[PDB]
Design an enzyme around this catalytic site. Structure first.
Site, short mmCIF file in Angstrom:
data_model
loop_
_atom_site.label_atom_id
_atom_site.label_comp_id
_atom_site.label_asym_id
_atom_site.label_seq_id
_atom_site.Cartn_x
_atom_site.Cartn_y
_atom_site.Cartn_z
N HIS A 1 -102.65 10.16 -72.60
CA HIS A 1 -103.11 9.46 -71.39
C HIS A 1 -101.91 8.85 -70.66
CE1 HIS A 1 -107.06 9.71 -73.44
NE2 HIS A 1 -107.42 10.06 -72.20
N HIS B 1 -100.85 13.55 -67.27
CA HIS B 1 -102.31 13.73 -67.24
C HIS B 1 -102.87 13.31 -65.88
CE1 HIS B 1 -106.54 13.61 -68.32
NE2 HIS B 1 -106.58 12.28 -68.20
N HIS C 1 -107.12 7.12 -62.42
CA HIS C 1 -108.27 7.11 -63.36
C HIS C 1 -107.95 6.65 -64.81
CE1 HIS C 1 -107.07 10.91 -65.12
NE2 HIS C 1 -107.99 10.71 -66.07
N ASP C 2 -106.70 6.81 -65.30
CA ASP C 2 -106.35 6.37 -66.66
C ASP C 2 -105.23 5.32 -66.66
OD1 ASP C 2 -108.14 7.56 -68.58
OD2 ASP C 2 -107.07 9.45 -68.49
N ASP D 1 -110.86 15.63 -65.03
CA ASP D 1 -110.39 14.94 -66.22
C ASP D 1 -110.18 15.88 -67.42
OD1 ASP D 1 -109.51 12.71 -67.57
OD2 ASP D 1 -111.53 11.92 -67.95
N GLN E 1 -112.91 21.72 -81.36
CA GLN E 1 -112.72 22.24 -80.01
C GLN E 1 -113.93 23.07 -79.62
OE1 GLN E 1 -110.29 21.79 -77.42
NE2 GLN E 1 -110.11 20.01 -78.73
C1 LIG Z 1 -109.98 11.41 -74.55
C2 LIG Z 1 -109.80 12.84 -74.05
C3 LIG Z 1 -111.11 13.41 -73.49
N1 LIG Z 1 -110.76 14.82 -73.29
C4 LIG Z 1 -110.81 15.74 -74.28
N2 LIG Z 1 -111.23 15.43 -75.55
C5 LIG Z 1 -111.25 16.35 -76.54
C6 LIG Z 1 -111.74 15.92 -77.90
C7 LIG Z 1 -110.98 16.41 -79.15
C8 LIG Z 1 -112.39 16.94 -78.85
N3 LIG Z 1 -110.87 17.62 -76.30
C9 LIG Z 1 -110.43 17.89 -75.06
CL1 LIG Z 1 -109.97 19.54 -74.91
C10 LIG Z 1 -110.37 17.04 -73.96
C11 LIG Z 1 -109.88 17.47 -72.58
MG LIG Z 2 -110.05 7.98 -69.15
ZN LIG Z 3 -108.40 11.04 -68.10
#
Ligand SMILES: CCCNc1nc(C2CC2)nc(Cl)c1C
Ligand SMILES: [Mg+2]
Ligand SMILES: [Zn+2]
Length: 307
Positions: free
Chosen positions: A62, A66, A100-101, A211, A263
């Site tokens: 983050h 990003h 946003h972050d 995002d 995933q």
């Molecule tokens: C905080 C990030 C939110 N975003 C994502 N969270 C995950 C979690 C591991 C399963 N995978 C992907 Cl690929 C993204 C983009």
């Molecule tokens: Mg966020």
């Molecule tokens: Zn984000």
């Protein structure tokens, strides 16, 4: 910024990764190609960009990179869906994406609520999202940083509301209900972009789509980004272990083998439905869904051993 980038930057799959020094300039270019060269006073815009960058920490995921990646995906959506949004929404959404972050500390809402962190006492739901918006307002409040100074008090309130709802929408907990509502409105034929509540929901889904856009890049890029995502999650897991708490498997660096399966679960439960619904509402965003399906296929191949 080279002449070769100008046409590549329009494509949804564009990866900003190899052009670090050019990221502030890429954001300016996207703003100019979206709402004109006189959209913001260039001096105030640069001051705002540079302060936003410094307010993104040196965490594995983050971070500043990003922010720009998310802003670029918004630009690609806006460029393929022109006439649909107002000047105020175009301005507002690009800013919301870059901010946003803001000031993310590498910790999830789960951690902050579980370890009763003061940010969770302040914001019980959408904890970090409420913080990101608060940080955006603080940066705008700084001297020579108000990019919306030329706007009327009425336009200023509108754009801050656009930004607020957009930033809060990036809380994945809110995405599930938002997407189910949008699918209902679309299927029943009741979806109306002139209707403000429907418009806010569409913008919210656009925010989630942006995002999570690392899942819409070419497989080599998607995979390297997933490595940063897990490095940040594993650092939170390490902190939890130090506090005598066993983290969830996804945040446990000793449970790496479960990543491809995690995933697969993430794409099937979150990413695929997100881009499927976005494609229905905004047909030109179809390349995002196609790219997401390609990466899902690559994750299935890793699980089957063809990594
Ligand atoms: C905080 C990030 C939110 N975003 C994502 N969270 C995950 C979690 C591991 C399963 N995978 C992907 Cl690929 C993204 C983009
Ligand atoms: Mg966020
Ligand atoms: Zn984000």
């Amino acid at each position: 910024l080279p002449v070769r980038l100008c046409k590549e930057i329009e494509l949804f799959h564009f990866d900003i990764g190899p052009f670090e020094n050019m990221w502030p300039g890429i954001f300016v270019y996207m703003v100019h190609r979206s709402c004109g060269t006189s959209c913001f006073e260039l001096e105030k815009l640069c001051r705002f960009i540079m302060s936003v960058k410094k307010n993104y920490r040196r965490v594995p995921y983050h971070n500043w990179k990003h922010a720009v990646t998310v802003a670029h995906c918004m630009y690609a959506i806006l460029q393929n869906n022109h006439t649909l949004f107002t000047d105020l929404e175009r301005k507002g959404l690009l800013i919301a994406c870059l901010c946003h972050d803001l000031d993310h500390r590498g910790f999830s809402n789960s951690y902050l609520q579980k370890f009763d962190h003061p940010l969770a006492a302040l914001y019980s739901t959408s904890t970090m999202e409420q913080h990101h918006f608060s940080q955006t307002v603080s940066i705008l409040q700084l001297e020579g940083h108000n990019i919306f100074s030329t706007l009327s008090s009425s336009e200023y309130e509108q754009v801050l509301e656009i930004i607020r709802k957009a930033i809060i929408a990036t809380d994945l907990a809110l995405y599930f209900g938002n997407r189910k509502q949008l699918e209902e409105m679309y299927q029943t034929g009741s979806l109306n972009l002139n209707n403000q509540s429907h418009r806010d929901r569409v913008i919210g889904l656009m925010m989630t789509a942006c995002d999570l856009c690392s899942v819409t890049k070419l497989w080599p890029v998607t995979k390297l980004t997933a490595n940063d995502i897990y490095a940040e999650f594993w650092a939170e897991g390490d902190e939890m272990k130090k506090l005598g708490i066993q983290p969830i498997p996804m945040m446990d660096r000793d449970k790496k083998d479960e990543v491809p399966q995690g995933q697969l679960g993430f794409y099937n439960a979150v990413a695929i439905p997100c881009y499927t619904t976005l494609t229905q509402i905004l047909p030109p965003t179809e390349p995002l869904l196609k790219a997401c399906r390609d990466n899902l296929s690559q994750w299935e191949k890793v699980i089957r051993g063809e990594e």
